[PDB]
Amino acid sequence: GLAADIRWTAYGVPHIRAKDERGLGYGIGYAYARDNACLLAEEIVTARGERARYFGSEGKSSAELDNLPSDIFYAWLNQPEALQAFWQAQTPAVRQLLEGYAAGFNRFLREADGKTTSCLGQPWLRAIATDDLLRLTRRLLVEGGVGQFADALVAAAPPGAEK
């Protein structure tokens, strides 16, 4: 199955040991959830294009984009066909790292009682899938490109009959 040995040193730095990528990913996802589950959950909402669904149109993402334009952009960027192509192009090692991460993040969520997590019980805090990690990866990928034109993409519409 999946298994990891985790040691934390001062300041909460994890040291993860495993015999393979799936177990290594399991350790990473668990350790990261313990520190940052709410952050990852929010950013996954953003990369799924679901901010307006949970927070309405008057809010912004942590990139300071309005929620509805951000959602249009990420719904476009992270369409099912794009995520499937990206997944199909991954090596077994990377697929295993991602499978392990999702499972380790979700194990922390099942066990959490609030010691280090402020958003338990929120509807947007939920078990994650490897596709969510692909969404995050793609969001980061385009930060030097079309991501800087997200508002401009959403604004692009043909003219009417103006003079």
Partner: protein, 548 residues
Amino acid sequence: SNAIAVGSERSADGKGMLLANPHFPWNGAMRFYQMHLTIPGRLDVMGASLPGLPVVNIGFSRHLAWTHTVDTSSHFTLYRLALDPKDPRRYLVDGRSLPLEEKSVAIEVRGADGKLSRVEHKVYQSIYGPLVVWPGKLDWNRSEAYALRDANLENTRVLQQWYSINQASDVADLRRRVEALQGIPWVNTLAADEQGNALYMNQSVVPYLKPELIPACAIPQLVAEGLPALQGQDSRCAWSRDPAAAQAGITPAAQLPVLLRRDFVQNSNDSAWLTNPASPLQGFSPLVSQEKPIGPRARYALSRLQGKQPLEAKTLEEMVTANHVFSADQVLPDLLRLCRDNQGEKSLARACAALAQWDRGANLDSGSGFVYFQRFMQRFAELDGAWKEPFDAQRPLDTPQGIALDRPQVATQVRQALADAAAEVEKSGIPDGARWGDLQVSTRGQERIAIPGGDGHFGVYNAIQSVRKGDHLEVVGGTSYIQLVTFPEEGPKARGLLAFSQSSDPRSPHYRDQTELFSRQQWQTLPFSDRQIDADPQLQRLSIREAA
């Protein structure tokens, strides 16, 4: 971001050394996180990573340390479309009218009443990519529109690339691994190894045009404004193909800048050009690297690095912790002379006194002279021909310098600029005697923590960006994961901090512990060996498992 790699010809110990000082957000999807990863026998790497990525992005291993800085290369191009004069949803390529594709997305929106409604939105796309509008610059009218082709949309190699970097043994191996896969999206790579090699690579995913196409395909006015814009009505302006590239239409690795030295390499987000001025990098595509004036952080770094004296770890650490406002070196001496020339102008007295007192830094205890200087500099930037020594391409390290006070017009405008800044500062409601650390903070629960450093645009190597929030400047990004690595005989010695602390959750014991240390500029050991890990009296262990 800043990075400095030192090799065997300049390090005090004759081995490699690396300073990693990325400047990234303090919150959100680019918030660094420290971790050490081991699969015994074949993977042992430590550093920091971005949220959701099961790999180390900046880090070190037994014989190698590496980091990244955002590069100046273009990672997309814009295409100016020639619209079909009968139909603005069609565009012409080689005179042939093509339809835009329309892809609709559907979004759920929570309303004032709490119910969901469905919003549908059309995304228009050309053969190049989606259309983009910047009102007043990139319009979509009846003649033209603009589409954007992003080179990293087909970069499915990005996770694999850092997985491979995490396995690299030394600088030669790191260079092979990156040149082989070309999965780095938009950063430079700098690295040092124990043997004393210092490496700079501008090896990222960059649209490729053969040299003869570049002047033919450019939109001149937009390229002059820094936009990588091409003629989208001409099929010959498609990105060029080369079998050696790892991805269709990107630049092959042999055509991208690399410098391998034994003295040093550095980068602070300028182009490859002056990575090490003893061996300028020139002759690349303008999509890749241009010879532009370097910014004050790199000018600062080169002022400390050039020469013959050995570099110690402490030297590199203090380049960060000095918080020196290097832009002051270029303007403050002539500005103070102007103050002395105007001791009768009552409106300037407080600014001149603050500027004169100032330690020229962005330390917690630095006085209000820093704030006067920033506001003055924001106005100085708008003046024309005010440098005494303008940028000289034959003296890129030492220009521009000085205020052209001998030109009566400049003296007038610079004095006005100072009076304006002085009035602006004094109109703010900042307490008399407040120091920089009283103003610039990072909020933790309802405590604040004073944060040293200042905006990289003023040449502060410890770059910190903040925004006014009520009565203070709230830090939003800047120095983040710090790592300084050397290679003594027992194993790598890594020192640093994660400035904003491991956890973003106020409930965590690790929400503000390194931020207190960052405030005090007290870097710490990054334990890597089993010996270092076991010597930690805070050590906690947990083993976990589940079925797949």
